[PDB]
Ligand binder design. Sequence first.
Ligand SMILES: Nc1ccn([C@H]2C[C@H](O)[C@@H](COP(=O)(O)OP(=O)(O)OP(=O)(O)O)O2)c(=O)n1
Ligand SMILES: [Mg+2]
Ligand SMILES: [Mg+2]
Ligand SMILES: [Mg+2]
Ligand code: NA
Length: 383
Amino acid sequence: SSRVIVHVDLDCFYAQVEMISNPELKDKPLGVQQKYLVVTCNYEARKLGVKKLMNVRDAKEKCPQLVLVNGEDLTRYREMSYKVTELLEEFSPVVERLGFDENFVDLTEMVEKRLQQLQSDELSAVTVSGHVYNNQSINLLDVLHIRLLVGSQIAAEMREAMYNQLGLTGCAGVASNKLLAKLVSGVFKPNQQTVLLPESCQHLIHSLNHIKEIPGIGYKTAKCLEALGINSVRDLQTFSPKILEKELGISVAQRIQKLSFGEDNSPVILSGPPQSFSEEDSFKKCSSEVEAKNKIEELLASLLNRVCQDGRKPHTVRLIIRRYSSEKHYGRESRQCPIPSHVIQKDVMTPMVDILMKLFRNMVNVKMPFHLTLLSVCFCNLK
DNA sequence: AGGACCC
DNA sequence: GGGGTCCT
Ligand SMILES: Nc1ccn([C@H]2C[C@H](O)[C@@H](COP(=O)(O)OP(=O)(O)OP(=O)(O)O)O2)c(=O)n1
Ligand SMILES: [Mg+2]
Ligand SMILES: [Mg+2]
Ligand SMILES: [Mg+2]
Ligand code: NA
């Protein structure tokens, strides 16, 4: 039952894609901009003080000569992200995506099949590729260490193929489960890889300084733990299971406390094609109102091409909006409805827009002043 | 339809 | 910001 899981995580992904298109940017500090946001930047910019998700002002001041490129259209990042998953799928079919630039692959079978092929006296020649977390000593007679080192060799083949075939560099983490592979993959960056031997697990988990650093504990849950006086990984590990459940539900409570020890039994699952296709536009009060028709028509036009290009067809459409002000929860609202079977045919635009516009009015009272900062359209329930 | 999480 | 996943 012991697995060897690899987590691959590309370097500064959007900036990396822009640097490749336009090598004139290869040596300049570079930031990818969406509205007033520097969503990410290359490693030249992270030297000069720029952070991911820093607004343009803080970043131009921290680095005046920061070159900026617009990254609001994700089409190119999207396309590259699938070329990566597809290439990893040649190694093992079951690849799980997490966002546009991370993949997990279960290497156990590949590892076992490579071990099956080594003769008695070349087992002792097995070596690591890249870093060993916490510099831990290898024990060549420990079969778990052996299988992890073969895992590290496979990861280095995957990184070399991504570079040689797609021009992309990234990091990899090899460990016994997904949580640990993903934590260890960030230890040496950019463009490096690390393997976690089982004895250093507690060390890696206790190296985190904030409980939100655990994948699966987000903004909301962390705020609730903070309020319970839970602040370190160890505070979570040792806190009352009963009380935790009462304050967060058997579900959230029991999975996070498990994660706090480094335990994660979830399988790597095959992502395959996408479950939804969406586009959004953000703006400052631009919409009020029914020119949204324009706005909604443009989203729709690009979305229609994507779903067309996909070749499965969608059966539900949804419209998402967001309303202006204030310090409270500015949550989104939406309306969905099925797409008429006759329309399921890829004129199209006109009845698709009529539908969206109806969903629009259902949400917004057109008789008073509107109040909108976001329009989004989603196609889903693909079939 | 909303919400939590991820990138 | 501009995307995604799955759950209640
Ligand atoms: N809240 C977020 C997080 C990420 N991204 C985008 C920008 C990144 O280029 C890409 C990958 O996210 P990562 O967190 O892996 O960030 P990077 O790949 O840019 O940097 P690193 O080298 O730290 O992985 O997803 C985004 O738009 N919004
Ligand atoms: Mg990442
Ligand atoms: Mg990355
Ligand atoms: Mg991915
Ligand atoms: Na987290």
